[PDB]
Symmetry: C2
Amino acid sequence: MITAQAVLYTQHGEPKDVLFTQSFEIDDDNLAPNEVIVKTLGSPVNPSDINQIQGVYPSKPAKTTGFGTTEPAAPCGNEGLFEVIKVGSNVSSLEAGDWVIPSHVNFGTWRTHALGNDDDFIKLPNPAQSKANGKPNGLTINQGATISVNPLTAYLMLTHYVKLTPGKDWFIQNGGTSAVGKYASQIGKLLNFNSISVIRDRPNLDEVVASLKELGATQVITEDQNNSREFGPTIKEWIKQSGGEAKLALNCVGGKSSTGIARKLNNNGLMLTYGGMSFQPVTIPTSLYIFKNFTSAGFWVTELLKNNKELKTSTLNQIIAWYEEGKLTDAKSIETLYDGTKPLHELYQDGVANSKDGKQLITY
Amino acid sequence: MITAQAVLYTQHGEPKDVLFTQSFEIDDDNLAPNEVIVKTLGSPVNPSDINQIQGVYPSKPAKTTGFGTTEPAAPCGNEGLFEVIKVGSNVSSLEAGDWVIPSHVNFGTWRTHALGNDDDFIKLPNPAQSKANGKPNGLTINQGATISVNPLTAYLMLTHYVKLTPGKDWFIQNGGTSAVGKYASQIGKLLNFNSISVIRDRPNLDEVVASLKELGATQVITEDQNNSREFGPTIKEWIKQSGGEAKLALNCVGGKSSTGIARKLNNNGLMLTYGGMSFQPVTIPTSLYIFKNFTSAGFWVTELLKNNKELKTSTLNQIIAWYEEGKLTDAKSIETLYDGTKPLHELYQDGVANSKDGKQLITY
């Protein structure tokens, strides 16, 4: 028997008010033929995790007595890296020591262990396997724990909707320093797509600009530059010199920022909105729709892949390969190790409260 | 020889400042085999005609010395109804007395006569022909003169993009009392599509609502009601009871109104923006794009029908037939007859200045 800990809530609200830690047992000596028991290695705090707890997210884990609690309760977290510790008699796809991520959302990753079916997980190579197989690198725990949403989102937005001609065409995106923004710059570099990253100004602008260009952004401009009508000629010249067109805009800000990047696309452009800044609607001038054949659509990785495991598999495999090859890098998470000296839910509450410092990863 | 008058400009600007009238000759005794001479019956003043003259509309007639001017000059007007006066030796598609409209935009319709090739025109049945064909009605001069922009726009937005299930599905539109809005309500009724028209509140609201429902709007609400999610219950029920879904939103307003109609669509909805009320961008909540698979795109009949003669042909044919069959009605225009006592360009300048009074049609 294993004694596990899970972060739960019986009522929606701010994480700081409703979360608590529940101890529960998993019987590793009584596994059904297709069952698997995993131990969590690390799981991040993402905005969607927080929105589910707040009760304002379209998809949420069902409440249950499953973790034994006194009163219906729901688990937290959708992303995370786990390691198989034991499998049932009919399990062949997974073995002890294998690294896995959940195959579906609402898994409840803010906990120490989980019991599921082999098909509730997707295997990733662990460092030992990558190294034994001759790869230059193995995935880090943060890379594995955060591989399921952000890297796939950047890859899919850049390749699944419009075909950018290598060396010539451009995409433009705001939220340039976001996790997805940084993955998109790298994927653009790897696939030879030109790109303009728009970012908020900051005290260390030059350092940030150099960093994004090294990741792969062709040009980096501030939101002030994005707002400048007088800057239009420079952008047009960048595009003219490459012999391509700006065909795709990635928006995660809305408001004036979305207006600015939409205006920089050539005729027949597509904008994909995949995030938004708290109560800032996507704002597009009427003229772009009428005269520039502009289209504005959405992107939600969860919905896109729900019934396309193959597309998901192919995408995940490419991100895994690039990590092993040392061609892709993650932004570093601030890691907080759970050692039992502080309640697990408190580590996540601090994570939620400190999200402004950087991505928070609770490790085990 | 025929002496004709044309409204021209040598430089873009406001109609009241840049228009003038040029007298020019057409030699009706020297027609090439495929040429035809037409005499204008009527041509309207549309926003696009005005924007073209202002220099803020991207599709425009080239400035040429064709009218015998000292400097290159551009003609004005994109739609209009003409009567064929004489045809060349190799013309068989048209004969004297036939009614025609330009086959392409940028022809210049604010003038008394024109010389062109037979394929620069599309034949419409004249009243005598409709009568001889046993039809209950023939087209009026206003119906023929205004057939190529607004009716085609309403018809194509409703049929060319998303397929609404007859007797079940819905479209919602703002600008409900606009010319296109009124055509859309009628075409919706003919296609058996349910619809909600959103209009501005006004003094004789009950009368307006009744008139729009008679035209074909299933339900009519005001912008205040469109903004009141507290009124939103009344709308969700209408759709539920019908058994269909709201799949298409037609927007010509932007701003808060565009947000309101977008929110009323079911998942996988499409918004087409075909107009906008001065510097009021199309504003759509981020959540509709991400969680409701919402898409917003544009509509411009000029670009859609460029290089698509068959689509234009079949659409025009259906509108013509509907007028003949008494199934479609146009809003009445304020008609100003050109008798030669006042410069032609002045009649059009007055038409531009008085467009708020109603559609201005200059007749001959």
